[PDB]
């Protein structure tokens, strides 16, 4: 019956990305004073399914110039990995007890953007190619610092296994120990997921919906959907990794009741970022990283390498 | 629709022969 467990992991999350869309227009609406979607609800609630139906019902043309195979395979990979990254996530009990699933989170995250590269390559359009390319730039440029700071915050939990990361937070929370790395992790999740100030992949006014343009109905729904999969997912990831909680094994549910709060509390923040800052432009986007984030990530890294020895505080896990 | 009736009201040949 493991299969029904998996299905039980995949349906609720898709429902969550739909209602995530709706919340996005809501909050992001009230920042603007204007109310968000409302009339169709009554509280808007029925909207996202009407939305998705509007999409899938609508004709999804196969472009004349595009090669078709890449053009179809890319969205598939997008939702694929967007969902697959969810499996080893301790809530509290992981669906899979990977010995080193964090590293796996990095693996999925790193194959993610490759789909963007195909998405813009097979699309054949000028905007497609240029936007896709700059997209891959910002992405990788952030995955390096990404993985380093994640390393440095992992020296002290003990090991790459995720469940232990609960155990190592049975009191103080990791964040008080190494918040600056939490900042850089936050922003790196704010760019790797391609979000608000780090907005370039969509391009928007800069490049009229970026790479995603030539995709029409359903595949567009897939990239859109998968994008929100990554946003909520890196949010949850940050939540478990920098914000611990009380956990009685006899009542696991209690913990989850807490956890969705602590993660939702993050996701909303991205939206409340979106309502706040103009995008960086491709120079500065990479400037602040290579010039400014990174060296601190290193100095902090040696520092965190060095605390366990000076403090004689080396974490247990073999 | 068209308003203000007609224009030239051109005459037509009589029914009677010759």
């Amino acid at each position: 019956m493991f299969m029904i467990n998996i299905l039980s992991l995949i349906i609720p999350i898709l429902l969550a990305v739909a209602f995530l869309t709706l919340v996005e227009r809501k909050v992001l609406g009230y920042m603007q004073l204007r109310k968000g979607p409302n009339v169709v609800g009554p509280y808007g609630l029925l909207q996202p399914i009407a939305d998705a139906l509007k999409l899938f019902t609508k004709e999804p043309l196969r472009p004349a110039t595009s090669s078709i195979s890449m053009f179809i395979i890319a969205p598939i990979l997008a939702l694929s990995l967007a969902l697959t990254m969810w499996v080893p996530l301790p809530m509290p009990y992981p669906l899979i007890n990977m010995n080193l699933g964090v590293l796996f989170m990095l693996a999925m995250s790193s194959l993610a953007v490759y789909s963007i590269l195909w998405s813009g390559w097979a699309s054949n359009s000028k905007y497609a190619l240029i936007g896709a390319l700059r997209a891959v730039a910002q992405t990788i440029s952030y995955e390096v610092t990404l993985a380093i700071i994640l390393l440095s915050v992992l020296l002290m939990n003990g090991s790459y296994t995720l469940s232990t990361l609960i155990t190592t937070q049975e009191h103080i929370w990791m964040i008080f120990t190494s918040w600056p790395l939490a900042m850089m992790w936050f922003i790196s999740t704010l760019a790797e997921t391609n979000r608000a100030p780090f907005d370039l992949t969509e391009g928007e006014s800069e490049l009229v919906s970026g790479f995603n343009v030539e995709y029409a109905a359903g595949p567009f729904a897939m990239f859109f959907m998968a994008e929100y999969a990554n946003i909520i997912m890196m949010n949850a990831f940050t939540a478990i990794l920098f914000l611990g909680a009380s956990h009685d094994p006899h009542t696991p549910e209690l913990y989850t009741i807490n956890f969705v709060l602590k993660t939702l509390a993050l996701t909303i923040t991205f939206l409340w970022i979106r309502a706040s800052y103009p995008r960086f432009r491709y120079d500065q986007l990479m400037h602040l990283l290579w010039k400014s984030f990174l060296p601190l990530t290193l100095a902090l890294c040696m520092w965190h390498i060095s605390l366990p020895i000076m403090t004689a505080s080396i974490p247990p896990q073999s | 629709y068209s308003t203000t009736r007609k224009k030239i009201q051109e005459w037509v040949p009589p029914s009677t022969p010759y």
Partner: protein
């Protein structure tokens, strides 16, 4: 097994969404509708060569840092070795060179990114 099963159910799920995406609206594709988008007016030419040294000049540096972090990964486990003084220098050492490499780029004006 376990993981292969979830991979299969995910991919089959997505592929199912694709098939219900195409074989459903059931309407009329035709030429010019299917022509590539170019903000209205037709393209002056199919995509060619957006060449830039400023791509690889940094992207290669990405690749040579990523190889480095690949060596950083063993660290959490190496931390529990019986003889840290033998280790610790190296734990610092690579990071210095990582930084050093960057530093060398920092000021030969090889890092113009963009």
């Amino acid at each position: 097994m376990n993981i292969m099963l979830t991979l299969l159910t995910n991919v089959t799920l997505a592929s199912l969404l694709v098939l219900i995406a195409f074989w459903l609206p059931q309407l009329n594709a035709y030429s010019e509708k299917t022509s590539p988008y170019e903000c209205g007016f037709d393209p002056m030419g199919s995509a060619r060569l957006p060449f830039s040294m400023k791509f690889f000049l940094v992207a290669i540096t990405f690749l040579l840092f990523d190889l480095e972090i690949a060596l950083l990964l063993p660290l959490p486990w190496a931390s529990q070795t019986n003889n840290l003084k033998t280790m610790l220098t190296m734990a610092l050492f690579l990071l210095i060179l990582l930084a050093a490499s960057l530093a060398y780029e920092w000021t030969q004006k090889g890092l113009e990114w963009a």
